[PDB]
């Protein structure tokens, strides 16, 4: 009953149990006067244990994208509060398993004396606990509206009082979460951006380059052509010197990408959109290629300095202005320097926040490694863990497929500890659409066993494989932090005779040793 | 104990319990005389319930790729046999949970009187049952060597007696599994191939085109250039007319791809490799681009006629011959018409076998939909099922990420049955690296609700999202086969103002209604 829906390991009675609530502009002051009710099973006051998670619930409901953020308040229950952690979020299952009345709203029942007597363990009330979200270690608290009347409300922060532009106050606060960490000063970036734009517009070669602008609707291919030369010319400016160095190698940061982005923007911004930050943001947010200007690629935010960020934004701003008359419909005039910059700043902040949050990189846990047309991932989280300290076997499933045409899997490289952790050659195989292919595994240079499929393996649209790696433990001795050669399994795809040195496509699955 | 490792639902006592075993050339006749033993926990005789799965175990152990296939025999146990289905393949877990001696080999213990008395349910012996493989509905039987001595062995098929070339006899037999079904006559294809090659070599314009071959080591870029013109010229031949029509539209079947493939082959075939079928096959099997010649793309085998397959193979054969002197190292002479054709035929057969086997297409069950840089999939099989016939809620997790740079998720389109099956707007959200974004969902034209994220959603390397769709059932009435608008959920990525008509990247997740 209660075992099916309640997580005892994670429930607890606490004195002065505190949590956080994010609220909208206009209510930061009135909410500190008291919590009050402004499916039914879930009608309740919502808080979280994470204040920066609370912050995300503070944006003006009618302008969720660019709107103003209100604040975060701390709500404390005096006395003893019982946090009942739930293993399911289906209310009928909860009411049933907890033997509750299958009719009255779950939350309504949570605030009854009987319910508090039964699962409160002496606490004055009960607050439901649920995981905040997939990919979050935060929890979500669900307070019964009546019991919530006992909450003491204190202010955490009022983003509006910080008097900063856009959602700068909210994002810089959340950034406090990680003290890597992208902790940028947007006031500094906002100011450098304006200065740079100014210096660029008022610039000999740039103004000269502008002269040659067809300054009339031209074809898209000609637009990009002009834009790529403009970009090249603009990057010579002393103000964009660092950006010239940082964007020199990675192809994602090339001029063609800036030009591509610039024309794409100029194309979707009509006059009414441009005269609205919310409308600009919604328009820009669905465009591809924003990574070229943000300097984000290969899993890293490369433009992580106020100086380089401001040069990148100033650069695309100038180009959007050039692109508007060639492939647009409005007066680039303000847009490029006004809402374009305001909207893009906001988007950077959204993406920087994502990378500041703890997340699994490709090939880790059940997160896919996408590369060369292939998609590989550990079938389950348990699969990605190699347990140690016992004599025995273990199996590990790795899912494999390719996007379209049939691509080969040459085999798989596995890290070992010869004697302690070995490949179990008889249980290691790969099934392609069910055809269980046996593998010829051989120890190679450097504590790695290379296993090859006995027959050809190809994956693609409609064709998938399950790589089942079996390992053998010769002793109970725990593998130690030096023992295994590496922390990944390497699935090898096709062979490319590139760099005059033939090599395979490598698809890595990262593991952790435990127990 | 036994509940933890034994699947009662799938175990049974059967009279004359039969199964199949695939064996190597040289043993098809001697194995019919009796089963006899030629980790330890798993030492046993191996059979399966699928004869075409058995067939795959018949290839000459020293030439697993191109070698000769022996046969399949049927092994029958007289009397009553108890098939004990196992829920785990870890022998220590089995011996422990079944209270067996944790020392003696599991299989050794399976052939004891005591063990047969305990779990045989009166049957003369016990055979272990295990799922054959991930992606297979077949089972694997594990016979105790001693008890296996009672088996009656009958012949199913001897591929060698069929007297066909390569592994034609084995693959055409397996093809019998699906009676779509690629059931090709390789003798016919082999014969048409030779005829076509002949007609091409002895052909005015082709011979003329050959004349102009630099016929000496030229650069790779020049090689492809010559090869693309040669290809174009060769496709005009009356013998390759159908192939000219079938390869006209899909870019994967273009001449650049044939030329690319041709030079890639010529590049990896040295003399010793070329004089060995096993070595040729192993060499070719790791090359990319085989889908252009097989005519396989977008999840379908397009070249599915003996006529069109033979034209495709004849065409690449001619080109490999041209590519050898330009970007190779041997005498194209025999290779292109000898082992090249033998090896490629084998590879086609491997891939056709994959597509003949039941498999889940992208976006179905936990199989990923890969498109436009995004990777999306149902978190679990249960998620991909929408259950009906009850009043209540259900949640469905969809995993989302993109390969590299930050790409947007505009929102998600969901099929409904207004009144009966609705979107639960309060529980439907998307978490990006943990940031739980709420969604504005609105009913639109045609029994579809479009939900948009309240704030910008971008995914890419290091950034992932979990789309959690919540549905609401207003009555116990079962959704019927006409009710829901479609069988998929459509996640929308970036917007491309292509075809002068702007559209989003569409990523579909296919579901099934059940219960
Ligand atoms: N806002 C949060 O901190 C928070 C925390 C965890 C989860 N959530 C999630 O967000 C969704 C909606 O929750 P929500 O709280 O933003 O919205 P809600 O739908 O409950 O609306 C209540 C809104 O009115 C405001 N309000 C103003 N004065 C109040 C007062 N005196 N007492 C109580 N509320 C007052 C709240 O701040 C909130 O913005 C939830 O269903 C849950 O998924 C929100
Ligand atoms: N061959 C099959 O039909 C079959 C079926 C299901 C699973 N498997 C799998 O293939 C792996 C190895 O099994 P396997 O059977 O190919 O190889 P094995 O390692 O048990 O080797 C025995 C080989 O010797 C042969 N043999 C010849 N005469 C025999 C005789 N008189 N009695 C018994 N065996 C005789 C068998 O045909 C087989 O080819 C298994 O571990 C399992 O994963 C094989």
UniProtKB/Swiss-Prot annotation, chains A, B:
It catalyses: diphthamide-[translation elongation factor 2] + NAD(+) = N-(ADP-D-ribosyl)diphthamide-[translation elongation factor 2] + nicotinamide + H(+). The record marks 145 as: Modification inactivates enzyme. GO terms for cellular component: extracellular region; extracellular space; plasma membrane. Disulfide bonds join 178-181, 441-451. The active site is at residue 140. NAD(+) binds at residues 21, 57. GO terms for molecular function: identical protein binding; NAD+-diphthamide ADP-ribosyltransferase activity; nucleotidyltransferase activity; protein transmembrane transporter activity; toxin activity. The keyword Transferase applies. Partially inhibited by 1,8-naphthalimide (NAP). Pfam families: Diphtheria_C, Diphtheria_R, Diphtheria_T. Gene3D superfamilies: Diphtheria Toxin, domain 1 (3.90.175.10), Diphtheria toxin, receptor-binding domain (2.60.40.700), Diphtheria toxin, translocation domain (1.10.490.40). Keywords: Cleavage on pair of basic residues, Disulfide bond, Glycosyltransferase, NAD, Nucleotidyltransferase, Signal, Toxin, Transferase. Proteolytic activation by host furin cleaves the protein in two parts, Diphtheria toxin fragment A and Diphtheria toxin fragment B; which remain associated via a disulfide bond. Coiled coil: none annotated. Its EC number is 2.4.2.36. The keyword Metal-binding does not apply. Homodimer. Diphtheria toxin, produced by a phage infecting Corynebacterium diphtheriae, is a proenzyme that, after activation, catalyzes the covalent attachment of the ADP ribose moiety of NAD to eukaryotic elongation factor 2 (eEF-2). Fragment A is the catalytic portion responsible for enzymatic ADP-ribosylation of elongation factor 2, while fragment B is responsible for binding of toxin to cell receptors and entry of fragment A. This is Diphtheria toxin.
């Amino acid at each position: 009953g209660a075992d099916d829906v309640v997580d005892s390991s994670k429930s607890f009675v606490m004195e002065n149990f505190s949590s956080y609530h994010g609220t909208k502009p206009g209510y930061v002051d009135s909410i500190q006067k008291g919590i009050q009710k402004p499916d039914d099973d879930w009608k309740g006051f919502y808080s979280t244990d994470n204040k920066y998670d609370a912050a995300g619930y503070s944006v003006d409901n009618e302008n969720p994208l660019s709107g103003k953020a209100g604040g975060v308040v701390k709500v404390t229950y005096p006395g003893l509060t019982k946090v009942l952690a739930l293993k399911v979020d289906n209310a009928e299952t909860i009411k049933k398993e907890l033997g509750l009345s299958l009719t009255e709203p779950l939350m309504e029942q949570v605030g009854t004396e009987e319910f508090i007597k039964r699962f409160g363990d002496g606490a004055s009330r009960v607050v439901l606990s649920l995981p905040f979200a997939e990919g979050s270690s935060s929890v979500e608290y669900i307070n019964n509206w009546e019991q919530a009347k006992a909450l003491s409300v204190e202010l955490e922060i009022n983003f509006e009082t910080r008097g900063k532009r856009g959602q700068d106050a909210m994002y810089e606060y959340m950034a406090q979460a990680c003290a890597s960490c992208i902790n940028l000063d947007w006031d500094v970036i906002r100011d450098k951006t304006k200065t740079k734009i100014e210096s660029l517009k008022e610039h000999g070669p740039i103004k000269n380059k502008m002269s040659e602008s067809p300054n009339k609707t031209v074809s898209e291919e000609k637009a990009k052509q002009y834009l790529e030369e403009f970009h090249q010319t603009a990057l010579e400016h002393p103000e964009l010197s660092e950006l010239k160095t940082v964007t020199g190698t990675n192809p994602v940061f090339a001029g063609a990408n800036y030009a591509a982005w610039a024309v794409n923007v100029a194309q979707v911004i009509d006059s009414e959109t441009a005269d609205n930050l919310e409308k600009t943001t919604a328009a820009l947010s669905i465009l591809p290629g924003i990574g070229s200007v943000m300097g984000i690629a290969d899993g890293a935010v490369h433009h992580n300095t106020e100086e380089i960020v401001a040069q990148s934004i100033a650069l695309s701003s100038l180009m959007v202005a050039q692109a508007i008359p060639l492939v647009g419909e409005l007066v680039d005039i303000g847009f490029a320097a006004y809402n374009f910059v305001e909207s893009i700043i906001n988007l950077f902040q959204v993406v920087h926040n994502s990378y500041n949050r703890p997340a699994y990189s490709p090939g880790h846990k059940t997160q896919p490694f996408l590369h060369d047309g292939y998609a590989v991932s550990w079938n389950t989280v348990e699969d990605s863990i190699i347990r140690t300290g016992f004599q025995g076997e273990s199996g590990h499933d790795i899912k494999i497929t390719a996007e379209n045409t049939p691509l080969p899997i040459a085999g798989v490289l596995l890290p070992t500890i010869p004697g302690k952790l070995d490949v179990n050659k008889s249980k290691t195989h790969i099934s392609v659409n069910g055809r269980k292919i046996r593998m010829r595994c051989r120890a190679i240079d450097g504590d790695v066993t290379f296993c090859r499929p006995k027959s050809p393996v190809y994956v693609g649209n409609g064709v998938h494989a399950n790589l089942h790696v079996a390992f053998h433990r010769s002793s109970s001795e725990k593998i130690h932090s030096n023992e295994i050669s590496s922390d990944s399994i390497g699935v090898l795809g096709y062979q490319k005779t590139v760099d005059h040195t033939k090599v395979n496509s490598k698809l890595s699955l990262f593991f952790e040793i435990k127990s």
